[PDB]
From a paper:
We provide X-ray crystal structures of EndoE, which show an architecture composed of four domains, including GH18 and GH20 glycoside hydrolases connected by two consecutive three α-helical bundles. We determine that the GH20 domain is an exo-β-1,2-N-acetylglucosaminidase, whereas the GH18 domain is an endo-β-1,4-N-acetylglucosaminidase that exclusively processes the central core of complex-type or high-mannose-type N-glycans. Both glycoside hydrolase domains act in a concerted manner to process diverse N-glycans on glycoproteins, including therapeutic IgG antibodies.
The structural comparison of EndoE-GH18L and the product bound EndoE-GH18L-Man5 revealed that the protein structure is mostly preserved upon glycan binding and that there are no substantial conformational changes (r.m.s.d. of 0.58 Å for 416 residues). The Man5 product could be modelled unambiguously in the electron density map, located at the center of the (β/α)8-barrel and surrounded by the loops 1 to 8. The GlcNAc (-1) residue adopts a chair conformation (4C1) in which O1 makes hydrogen bonds with the side chains of E186 and Q243, and O3 establishes an intramolecular hydrogen bond with the cyclic oxygen atom in the Man (-2) ring. The N2 atom of the acetamide group interacts through hydrogen bonds with the side chains of D184 and E186, whereas the O7 atom makes a hydrogen bond with the side chain of Y245. This conformation likely corresponds to a stage of the catalytic cycle of the enzyme shortly before the release of the glycan product. The crystal structure of the EndoE-GH18L-Man5 complex reveals that the Man5 glycan is accommodated in a groove that forms a narrow space for the α(1,3) antenna. Specifically, loop 1 of the GH18 domain clearly restricts the access of additional Man residues with respect to Man (-6). In that sense, our crystal structure of the EndoE-GH18L-Man5 complex unveils the molecular mechanism of HM-type N-glycan substrate recognition and specificity of EndoE. Supporting this notion, the crystal structure of the EndoE-GH18L-Man5 complex and docking calculations of EndoE-GH18L with Man6, Man7, and Man9 show that Man6 can bind to the active site of the GH18 domain because the additional mannose (Man (-7)) of the α(1,3) antenna can interact with loop 1 of the enzyme.
Author numbering: 61 to 485
The structure:
Amino acid sequence: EKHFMVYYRAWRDKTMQGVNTTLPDENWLTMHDIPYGIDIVNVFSYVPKGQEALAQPFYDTLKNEYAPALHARGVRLVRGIDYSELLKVPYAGTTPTEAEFDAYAKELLTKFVDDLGIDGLDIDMETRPSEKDIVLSNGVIRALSKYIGPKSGTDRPFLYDTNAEYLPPLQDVSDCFDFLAYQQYGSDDKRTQRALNNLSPVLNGERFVPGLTFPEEQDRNRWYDTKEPYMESNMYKVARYSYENNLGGMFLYALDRDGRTYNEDDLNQIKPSNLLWTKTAIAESKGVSLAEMKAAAQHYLKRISYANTDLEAQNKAAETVTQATTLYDVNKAILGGDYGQGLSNTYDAELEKGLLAIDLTTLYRALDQAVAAIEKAESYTPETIQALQTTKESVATELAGKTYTAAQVTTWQTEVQTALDNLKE
Ligand SMILES: CC(=O)N[C@@H]1[C@@H](O)[C@H](O[C@@H]2O[C@H](CO[C@H]3O[C@H](CO[C@H]4O[C@H](CO)[C@@H](O)[C@H](O)[C@@H]4O)[C@@H](O)[C@H](O[C@H]4O[C@H](CO)[C@@H](O)[C@H](O)[C@@H]4O)[C@@H]3O)[C@@H](O)[C@H](O[C@H]3O[C@H](CO)[C@@H](O)[C@H](O)[C@@H]3O)[C@@H]2O)[C@@H](CO)O[C@H]1O
Protein backbone atom coordinates (compact mmCIF):
# COMPACT_ATOMS: atom_id res chain seq x y z
CA GLU A 1 0.00 0.00 0.00
CA LYS A 2 2.10 2.87 -1.33
CA HIS A 3 1.23 6.57 -1.17
CA PHE A 4 2.26 9.31 -3.55
CA MET A 5 1.44 12.84 -2.43
CA VAL A 6 1.88 16.27 -4.00
CA TYR A 7 1.74 19.76 -2.51
CA TYR A 8 -0.48 21.66 -4.95
CA ARG A 9 0.43 25.35 -4.80
CA ALA A 10 -3.09 26.76 -4.89
CA TRP A 11 -2.02 30.24 -6.03
CA ARG A 12 -0.63 28.71 -9.25
CA ASP A 13 -4.02 27.36 -10.33
CA LYS A 14 -5.72 29.05 -13.29
CA THR A 15 -8.46 30.25 -10.92
CA MET A 16 -5.93 32.51 -9.15
CA GLN A 17 -4.27 35.62 -10.56
CA GLY A 18 -2.09 38.03 -8.62
CA VAL A 19 -2.34 35.93 -5.44
CA ASN A 20 0.91 35.40 -3.51
CA THR A 21 3.08 36.66 -6.37
CA THR A 22 4.07 39.77 -8.30
CA LEU A 23 4.51 38.00 -11.66
CA PRO A 24 1.87 38.97 -14.27
CA ASP A 25 2.11 35.51 -15.85
CA GLU A 26 -1.10 33.52 -16.28
CA ASN A 27 -1.25 30.15 -14.56
CA TRP A 28 -1.15 27.08 -16.79
CA LEU A 29 -2.71 24.17 -14.87
CA THR A 30 -5.79 23.23 -12.89
CA MET A 31 -6.20 20.40 -10.40
CA HIS A 32 -7.71 18.28 -13.18
CA ASP A 33 -4.18 18.10 -14.60
CA ILE A 34 -2.73 16.39 -11.50
CA PRO A 35 -1.35 13.08 -12.85
CA TYR A 36 -2.91 9.72 -12.08
CA GLY A 37 -1.29 7.57 -9.41
CA ILE A 38 -1.35 10.39 -6.84
CA ASP A 39 -3.65 9.30 -4.02
CA ILE A 40 -3.19 12.30 -1.68
CA VAL A 41 -3.18 15.95 -2.79
CA ASN A 42 -2.25 18.66 -0.28
CA VAL A 43 -4.11 21.82 -1.26
CA PHE A 44 -1.22 24.03 -0.14
CA SER A 45 -2.44 27.63 -0.04
CA TYR A 46 -0.93 30.81 1.37
CA VAL A 47 -2.81 34.08 0.83
CA PRO A 48 -0.99 37.32 1.75
CA LYS A 49 -3.14 39.58 3.91
CA GLY A 50 -5.40 41.60 1.63
CA GLN A 51 -5.80 39.05 -1.19
CA GLU A 52 -8.50 36.77 0.28
CA ALA A 53 -11.06 37.85 -2.33
CA LEU A 54 -8.61 37.00 -5.12
CA ALA A 55 -8.18 33.47 -3.74
CA GLN A 56 -11.89 32.87 -3.08
CA PRO A 57 -12.61 31.76 -6.70
CA PHE A 58 -10.08 28.95 -6.31
CA TYR A 59 -11.63 27.78 -3.04
CA ASP A 60 -15.07 27.77 -4.67
CA THR A 61 -13.83 25.82 -7.70
CA LEU A 62 -12.06 23.43 -5.32
CA LYS A 63 -15.18 22.67 -3.30
CA ASN A 64 -17.46 22.48 -6.35
CA GLU A 65 -15.25 21.01 -9.11
CA TYR A 66 -11.69 19.97 -8.26
CA ALA A 67 -12.47 18.09 -5.05
CA PRO A 68 -15.42 16.06 -6.44
CA ALA A 69 -13.50 15.23 -9.63
CA LEU A 70 -10.46 14.08 -7.65
CA HIS A 71 -12.64 12.09 -5.25
CA ALA A 72 -14.13 10.31 -8.26
CA ARG A 73 -10.56 9.32 -9.18
CA GLY A 74 -10.06 7.90 -5.68
CA VAL A 75 -7.86 10.82 -4.58
CA ARG A 76 -8.08 12.12 -1.02
CA LEU A 77 -7.29 15.77 -0.35
CA VAL A 78 -5.70 17.44 2.67
CA ARG A 79 -5.25 21.07 3.71
CA GLY A 80 -1.88 22.34 4.87
CA ILE A 81 -2.00 24.43 8.04
CA ASP A 82 0.75 25.91 10.16
CA TYR A 83 1.64 24.16 13.40
CA SER A 84 1.01 27.45 15.22
CA GLU A 85 -2.69 27.08 14.33
CA LEU A 86 -2.93 24.28 16.90
CA LEU A 87 -1.55 26.71 19.49
CA LYS A 88 -4.50 29.11 19.07
CA VAL A 89 -6.87 26.76 20.95
CA PRO A 90 -9.21 28.93 23.06
CA TYR A 91 -9.44 28.08 26.75
CA ALA A 92 -10.72 29.84 29.86
CA GLY A 93 -8.50 28.60 32.70
CA THR A 94 -4.76 28.03 32.78
CA THR A 95 -4.80 25.00 30.45
CA PRO A 96 -7.42 23.78 27.96
CA THR A 97 -9.84 21.08 29.04
CA GLU A 98 -10.68 18.04 26.92
CA ALA A 99 -13.89 19.69 25.73
CA GLU A 100 -12.05 22.84 24.65
CA PHE A 101 -9.52 20.76 22.71
CA ASP A 102 -12.39 18.95 20.99
CA ALA A 103 -14.14 22.25 20.24
CA TYR A 104 -11.03 23.71 18.62
CA ALA A 105 -10.43 20.49 16.66
CA LYS A 106 -13.95 20.64 15.22
CA GLU A 107 -13.41 24.35 14.57
CA LEU A 108 -10.24 23.62 12.59
CA LEU A 109 -11.94 20.84 10.63
CA THR A 110 -14.87 23.07 9.68
CA LYS A 111 -12.64 26.05 8.87
CA PHE A 112 -9.86 24.45 6.81
CA VAL A 113 -11.41 21.18 5.60
CA ASP A 114 -15.18 20.73 5.59
CA ASP A 115 -15.81 24.23 4.22
CA LEU A 116 -13.78 23.22 1.13
CA GLY A 117 -15.08 19.70 0.54
CA ILE A 118 -11.65 18.33 1.49
CA ASP A 119 -10.99 15.15 3.45
CA GLY A 120 -8.14 15.77 5.89
CA LEU A 121 -5.43 17.97 7.39
CA ASP A 122 -1.65 18.38 7.26
CA ILE A 123 0.33 19.96 10.10
CA ASP A 124 3.39 21.87 8.85
CA MET A 125 5.82 21.85 11.80
CA GLU A 126 9.19 23.40 10.93
CA THR A 127 9.79 24.75 14.43
CA ARG A 128 11.28 23.77 17.80
CA PRO A 129 8.25 24.49 20.01
CA SER A 130 8.50 24.59 23.79
CA GLU A 131 6.83 22.25 26.26
CA LYS A 132 4.06 24.81 26.81
CA ASP A 133 3.31 24.92 23.08
CA ILE A 134 3.48 21.13 22.89
CA VAL A 135 0.86 20.67 25.62
CA LEU A 136 -1.63 22.60 23.48
CA SER A 137 -0.54 20.96 20.22
CA ASN A 138 -0.85 17.49 21.76
CA GLY A 139 -4.33 18.26 23.04
CA VAL A 140 -5.45 19.61 19.67
CA ILE A 141 -3.91 16.73 17.69
CA ARG A 142 -5.41 14.08 19.97
CA ALA A 143 -8.79 15.80 19.63
CA LEU A 144 -8.47 15.85 15.84
CA SER A 145 -7.56 12.15 15.82
CA LYS A 146 -11.17 11.46 16.82
CA TYR A 147 -12.37 12.66 13.40
CA ILE A 148 -9.38 12.19 11.05
CA GLY A 149 -6.41 9.87 10.83
CA PRO A 150 -5.95 6.22 11.78
CA LYS A 151 -7.51 6.60 15.24
CA SER A 152 -10.72 8.07 13.76
CA GLY A 153 -11.95 5.03 11.82
CA THR A 154 -12.39 7.06 8.63
CA ASP A 155 -10.60 7.37 5.30
CA ARG A 156 -9.74 11.00 6.07
CA PRO A 157 -5.96 11.60 6.20
CA PHE A 158 -4.18 13.28 9.10
CA LEU A 159 -0.60 14.14 8.15
CA TYR A 160 2.41 15.67 9.88
CA ASP A 161 5.02 17.27 7.60
CA THR A 162 8.41 18.53 8.74
CA ASN A 163 11.96 19.16 7.55
CA ALA A 164 13.77 18.17 10.78
CA GLU A 165 13.40 15.44 13.42
CA TYR A 166 12.34 17.39 16.51
CA LEU A 167 10.60 14.64 18.49
CA PRO A 168 9.03 16.46 21.51
CA PRO A 169 6.05 17.78 19.51
CA LEU A 170 5.64 14.38 17.82
CA GLN A 171 6.53 11.63 20.30
CA ASP A 172 3.32 11.91 22.36
CA VAL A 173 0.92 11.99 19.38
CA SER A 174 2.83 10.11 16.69
CA ASP A 175 0.17 7.40 16.33
CA CYS A 176 -2.50 9.97 15.38
CA PHE A 177 -1.09 10.53 11.87
CA ASP A 178 -1.36 8.30 8.81
CA PHE A 179 2.27 9.10 8.00
CA LEU A 180 4.96 11.77 8.33
CA ALA A 181 5.91 13.81 5.26
CA TYR A 182 9.65 14.49 5.47
CA GLN A 183 10.91 17.40 3.38
CA GLN A 184 14.47 16.80 2.18
CA TYR A 185 14.70 19.21 -0.73
CA GLY A 186 18.10 19.04 -2.41
CA SER A 187 19.13 15.82 -0.65
CA ASP A 188 19.37 12.18 -1.66
CA ASP A 189 18.61 8.87 0.09
CA LYS A 190 21.42 9.38 2.62
CA ARG A 191 19.47 12.12 4.39
CA THR A 192 16.40 9.92 3.94
CA GLN A 193 17.81 7.08 6.02
CA ARG A 194 19.46 9.53 8.45
CA ALA A 195 16.05 11.04 9.22
CA LEU A 196 14.39 7.62 9.29
CA ASN A 197 16.86 6.53 11.97
CA ASN A 198 16.48 9.78 13.92
CA LEU A 199 12.68 9.37 13.77
CA SER A 200 12.81 5.64 14.57
CA PRO A 201 11.66 5.96 18.23
CA VAL A 202 8.46 7.75 17.12
CA LEU A 203 7.74 6.50 13.59
CA ASN A 204 8.06 3.31 11.57
CA GLY A 205 9.59 3.49 8.11
CA GLU A 206 6.36 2.30 6.49
CA ARG A 207 4.70 5.55 7.66
CA PHE A 208 7.58 7.77 6.48
CA VAL A 209 7.04 9.56 3.16
CA PRO A 210 10.14 11.44 1.93
CA GLY A 211 9.59 14.23 -0.55
CA LEU A 212 11.51 16.48 -2.90
CA THR A 213 10.75 19.74 -4.69
CA PHE A 214 10.93 21.39 -8.07
CA PRO A 215 12.59 24.81 -8.51
CA GLU A 216 10.19 27.54 -7.43
CA GLU A 217 10.26 30.78 -9.40
CA GLN A 218 11.91 33.74 -7.67
CA ASP A 219 13.21 31.43 -4.92
CA ARG A 220 16.26 32.40 -2.89
CA ASN A 221 16.95 28.75 -2.04
CA ARG A 222 18.52 26.26 -4.46
CA TRP A 223 17.23 22.68 -4.25
CA TYR A 224 18.36 20.56 -7.21
CA ASP A 225 16.25 17.39 -7.10
CA THR A 226 16.20 16.91 -10.89
CA LYS A 227 19.09 16.36 -13.30
CA GLU A 228 20.32 14.08 -16.06
CA PRO A 229 21.55 11.28 -16.02
CA TYR A 230 18.22 10.41 -14.41
CA MET A 231 19.71 7.73 -12.17
CA GLU A 232 21.97 10.39 -10.60
CA SER A 233 19.11 12.74 -9.66
CA ASN A 234 17.85 12.90 -6.09
CA MET A 235 14.39 12.05 -7.42
CA TYR A 236 15.46 8.62 -8.70
CA LYS A 237 17.54 7.91 -5.60
CA VAL A 238 14.74 8.80 -3.19
CA ALA A 239 12.03 7.01 -5.18
CA ARG A 240 14.07 3.82 -5.52
CA TYR A 241 15.07 3.95 -1.84
CA SER A 242 11.43 4.41 -0.83
CA TYR A 243 10.40 1.41 -2.93
CA GLU A 244 13.31 -0.77 -1.83
CA ASN A 245 12.95 -0.10 1.91
CA ASN A 246 9.13 -0.31 1.97
CA LEU A 247 8.66 3.33 2.95
CA GLY A 248 5.22 4.92 3.06
CA GLY A 249 5.85 6.30 -0.42
CA MET A 250 7.00 9.66 -1.74
CA PHE A 251 5.75 13.21 -2.18
CA LEU A 252 6.68 16.18 -4.35
CA TYR A 253 6.37 19.91 -3.74
CA ALA A 254 5.40 22.45 -6.41
CA LEU A 255 3.93 20.10 -8.99
CA ASP A 256 3.41 23.02 -11.38
CA ARG A 257 7.19 23.53 -11.53
CA ASP A 258 8.01 20.05 -12.86
CA GLY A 259 10.99 20.36 -15.20
CA ARG A 260 11.77 23.96 -14.27
CA THR A 261 15.22 25.29 -13.35
CA TYR A 262 16.71 28.25 -11.50
CA ASN A 263 18.02 29.72 -14.75
CA GLU A 264 17.05 33.33 -15.39
CA ASP A 265 14.39 32.27 -17.91
CA ASP A 266 12.67 29.85 -15.52
CA LEU A 267 13.38 31.85 -12.37
CA ASN A 268 11.01 34.70 -13.29
CA GLN A 269 8.53 32.92 -15.57
CA ILE A 270 5.47 30.69 -15.33
CA LYS A 271 5.59 27.99 -18.00
CA PRO A 272 3.63 24.81 -18.74
CA SER A 273 5.08 21.43 -17.87
CA ASN A 274 4.71 17.91 -19.24
CA LEU A 275 5.03 16.72 -15.61
CA LEU A 276 7.64 14.20 -16.78
CA TRP A 277 9.47 14.05 -13.45
CA THR A 278 6.27 13.63 -11.42
CA LYS A 279 5.00 10.65 -13.42
CA THR A 280 8.47 9.09 -13.51
CA ALA A 281 8.69 9.46 -9.73
CA ILE A 282 5.25 7.91 -9.24
CA ALA A 283 6.35 4.91 -11.30
CA GLU A 284 9.77 4.60 -9.64
CA SER A 285 8.30 4.81 -6.13
CA LYS A 286 5.58 2.28 -6.95
CA GLY A 287 8.19 -0.12 -8.34
CA VAL A 288 6.75 -0.27 -11.85
CA SER A 289 8.61 -2.75 -14.03
CA LEU A 290 10.17 -1.52 -17.26
CA ALA A 291 8.00 -3.95 -19.24
CA GLU A 292 4.86 -2.44 -17.70
CA MET A 293 6.03 1.10 -18.50
CA LYS A 294 6.94 0.19 -22.08
CA ALA A 295 3.59 -1.55 -22.60
CA ALA A 296 1.68 1.54 -21.45
CA ALA A 297 3.86 3.84 -23.57
CA GLN A 298 3.33 1.69 -26.68
CA HIS A 299 -0.43 1.53 -26.08
CA TYR A 300 -0.52 5.33 -25.92
CA LEU A 301 1.65 5.76 -29.02
CA LYS A 302 -0.62 3.36 -30.91
CA ARG A 303 -3.85 5.11 -29.96
CA ILE A 304 -2.53 8.56 -31.00
CA SER A 305 -0.91 7.46 -34.29
CA TYR A 306 -4.17 7.89 -36.23
CA ALA A 307 -4.47 11.58 -35.30
CA ASN A 308 -0.76 12.49 -35.25
CA THR A 309 0.60 13.46 -38.67
CA ASP A 310 4.29 13.28 -37.64
CA LEU A 311 5.09 9.69 -38.57
CA GLU A 312 8.83 10.28 -38.11
CA ALA A 313 8.31 11.41 -34.51
CA GLN A 314 6.02 8.41 -33.99
CA ASN A 315 8.78 6.06 -35.18
CA LYS A 316 11.41 7.78 -33.04
CA ALA A 317 9.22 7.66 -29.92
CA ALA A 318 8.31 4.00 -30.41
CA GLU A 319 11.95 3.03 -31.00
CA THR A 320 13.14 4.99 -27.96
CA VAL A 321 10.45 3.31 -25.84
CA THR A 322 11.66 -0.09 -27.04
CA GLN A 323 15.29 0.89 -26.39
CA ALA A 324 14.56 2.54 -23.03
CA THR A 325 16.49 1.32 -19.99
CA THR A 326 14.82 3.45 -17.29
CA LEU A 327 11.27 4.57 -16.54
CA TYR A 328 12.43 8.15 -17.06
CA ASP A 329 13.46 7.28 -20.62
CA VAL A 330 10.11 5.61 -21.36
CA ASN A 331 8.24 8.70 -20.16
CA LYS A 332 10.60 11.10 -21.95
CA ALA A 333 10.22 9.26 -25.27
CA ILE A 334 6.60 10.47 -25.37
CA LEU A 335 6.65 13.60 -23.20
CA GLY A 336 10.01 15.00 -24.31
CA GLY A 337 12.49 16.78 -22.10
CA ASP A 338 10.25 19.83 -21.67
CA TYR A 339 6.70 20.88 -22.44
CA GLY A 340 6.05 20.88 -26.18
CA GLN A 341 9.36 19.17 -27.03
CA GLY A 342 7.61 15.78 -27.07
CA LEU A 343 5.09 13.93 -29.19
CA SER A 344 2.60 14.52 -26.35
CA ASN A 345 2.40 16.86 -23.35
CA THR A 346 -0.19 14.91 -21.32
CA TYR A 347 0.67 11.19 -21.53
CA ASP A 348 -0.03 9.65 -18.12
CA ALA A 349 1.28 6.14 -17.49
CA GLU A 350 -1.27 5.41 -14.75
CA LEU A 351 -4.23 6.74 -16.74
CA GLU A 352 -3.06 4.70 -19.74
CA LYS A 353 -2.78 1.65 -17.47
CA GLY A 354 -6.40 2.19 -16.50
CA LEU A 355 -7.30 2.43 -20.18
CA LEU A 356 -5.46 -0.80 -21.05
CA ALA A 357 -8.56 -2.88 -20.23
CA ILE A 358 -10.51 -1.52 -23.23
CA ASP A 359 -10.09 -3.48 -26.46
CA LEU A 360 -9.30 -1.36 -29.53
CA THR A 361 -8.49 -4.09 -32.08
CA THR A 362 -11.83 -3.78 -33.87
CA LEU A 363 -11.54 0.01 -33.88
CA TYR A 364 -7.93 -0.27 -35.02
CA ARG A 365 -8.72 -2.48 -38.01
CA ALA A 366 -11.66 -0.25 -38.93
CA LEU A 367 -9.41 2.82 -38.79
CA ASP A 368 -6.68 1.06 -40.80
CA GLN A 369 -9.20 0.20 -43.52
CA ALA A 370 -10.37 3.83 -43.43
CA VAL A 371 -6.76 4.99 -43.85
CA ALA A 372 -6.33 2.57 -46.76
CA ALA A 373 -9.47 4.00 -48.37
CA ILE A 374 -8.14 7.54 -47.89
CA GLU A 375 -4.93 6.35 -49.56
CA LYS A 376 -6.96 5.19 -52.58
CA ALA A 377 -9.12 8.29 -52.38
CA GLU A 378 -9.36 8.93 -56.12
CA SER A 379 -10.99 5.50 -56.58
CA TYR A 380 -14.27 6.20 -54.71
CA THR A 381 -17.01 8.80 -54.92
CA PRO A 382 -16.24 12.04 -53.02
CA GLU A 383 -19.61 12.25 -51.25
CA THR A 384 -18.69 9.06 -49.36
CA ILE A 385 -14.95 9.47 -48.78
CA GLN A 386 -15.74 12.80 -47.16
CA ALA A 387 -18.04 11.07 -44.68
CA LEU A 388 -15.25 8.55 -44.08
CA GLN A 389 -12.62 11.27 -43.60
CA THR A 390 -14.75 13.34 -41.23
CA THR A 391 -15.68 10.30 -39.13
CA LYS A 392 -12.11 8.96 -39.14
CA GLU A 393 -10.53 12.27 -38.13
CA SER A 394 -13.15 12.83 -35.42
CA VAL A 395 -12.68 9.31 -34.05
CA ALA A 396 -8.89 9.66 -34.20
CA THR A 397 -8.98 12.99 -32.37
CA GLU A 398 -11.26 11.54 -29.70
CA LEU A 399 -9.13 8.38 -29.44
CA ALA A 400 -5.99 10.46 -28.85
CA GLY A 401 -7.72 12.37 -26.05
CA LYS A 402 -6.96 12.19 -22.35
CA THR A 403 -9.35 9.32 -21.60
CA TYR A 404 -12.12 7.23 -23.14
CA THR A 405 -14.55 4.48 -22.18
CA ALA A 406 -15.54 1.13 -23.67
CA ALA A 407 -18.90 2.56 -24.77
CA GLN A 408 -17.19 5.39 -26.67
CA VAL A 409 -14.89 2.88 -28.37
CA THR A 410 -17.92 0.83 -29.40
CA THR A 411 -19.61 3.95 -30.80
CA TRP A 412 -16.45 4.85 -32.74
CA GLN A 413 -16.15 1.32 -34.12
CA THR A 414 -19.75 1.55 -35.31
CA GLU A 415 -19.27 5.00 -36.85
CA VAL A 416 -16.06 4.17 -38.73
CA GLN A 417 -17.45 0.83 -39.89
CA THR A 418 -20.66 2.41 -41.21
CA ALA A 419 -18.64 5.07 -43.03
CA LEU A 420 -16.59 2.22 -44.51
CA ASP A 421 -19.66 0.24 -45.59
CA ASN A 422 -21.06 3.34 -47.33
CA LEU A 423 -18.23 3.90 -49.85
CA LYS A 424 -19.38 3.91 -53.47
CA GLU A 425 -17.40 2.35 -56.31
C1 LIG B 1 5.17 21.57 3.42
C2 LIG B 1 6.22 22.47 2.84
O1 LIG B 1 6.73 22.26 1.75
N1 LIG B 1 6.55 23.53 3.59
C3 LIG B 1 7.50 24.55 3.17
C4 LIG B 1 6.96 25.33 1.98
O2 LIG B 1 5.77 26.01 2.38
C5 LIG B 1 8.01 26.35 1.56
O3 LIG B 1 7.53 26.99 0.37
C6 LIG B 1 7.02 28.30 0.48
O4 LIG B 1 5.77 28.27 1.15
C7 LIG B 1 5.18 29.58 1.30
C8 LIG B 1 3.92 29.41 2.11
O5 LIG B 1 4.27 29.07 3.45
C9 LIG B 1 3.48 29.67 4.43
O6 LIG B 1 2.17 29.12 4.41
C10 LIG B 1 2.17 27.69 4.60
C11 LIG B 1 0.75 27.22 4.41
O7 LIG B 1 -0.06 27.72 5.48
C12 LIG B 1 -0.76 28.89 5.20
O8 LIG B 1 -2.14 28.59 5.10
C13 LIG B 1 -2.65 27.93 6.28
C14 LIG B 1 -4.09 27.57 5.99
O9 LIG B 1 -4.84 28.71 5.60
C15 LIG B 1 -2.49 28.85 7.49
O10 LIG B 1 -2.91 28.16 8.66
C16 LIG B 1 -1.04 29.28 7.64
O11 LIG B 1 -0.90 30.22 8.69
C17 LIG B 1 -0.52 29.87 6.33
O12 LIG B 1 -1.18 31.10 6.06
C18 LIG B 1 2.71 27.37 5.99
O13 LIG B 1 2.72 25.96 6.17
C19 LIG B 1 4.12 27.93 6.11
O14 LIG B 1 4.58 27.74 7.45
C20 LIG B 1 5.68 26.87 7.63
O15 LIG B 1 6.89 27.59 7.56
C21 LIG B 1 7.00 28.62 8.56
C22 LIG B 1 8.28 29.38 8.27
O16 LIG B 1 8.22 30.02 7.00
C23 LIG B 1 6.99 27.99 9.94
O17 LIG B 1 7.05 29.02 10.93
C24 LIG B 1 5.71 27.18 10.12
O18 LIG B 1 5.73 26.50 11.37
C25 LIG B 1 5.54 26.18 8.99
O19 LIG B 1 6.50 25.14 9.10
C26 LIG B 1 4.13 29.42 5.79
O20 LIG B 1 3.43 30.15 6.80
C27 LIG B 1 4.91 30.18 -0.07
O21 LIG B 1 4.37 31.49 0.08
C28 LIG B 1 6.21 30.23 -0.86
O22 LIG B 1 5.90 30.65 -2.20
C29 LIG B 1 6.30 31.95 -2.57
O23 LIG B 1 7.69 31.96 -2.84
C30 LIG B 1 8.07 31.04 -3.87
C31 LIG B 1 9.58 31.06 -3.94
O24 LIG B 1 10.17 30.53 -2.75
C32 LIG B 1 7.41 31.44 -5.18
O25 LIG B 1 7.74 30.49 -6.18
C33 LIG B 1 5.90 31.49 -5.00
O26 LIG B 1 5.29 32.00 -6.18
C34 LIG B 1 5.52 32.36 -3.81
O27 LIG B 1 5.76 33.73 -4.11
C35 LIG B 1 6.86 28.86 -0.92
O28 LIG B 1 6.08 27.98 -1.71
C36 LIG B 1 9.34 25.67 1.27
C37 LIG B 1 10.45 26.64 0.92
O29 LIG B 1 10.17 27.34 -0.28
O30 LIG B 1 9.77 24.95 2.44
C38 LIG B 1 8.86 23.93 2.83
O31 LIG B 1 9.35 23.27 3.95
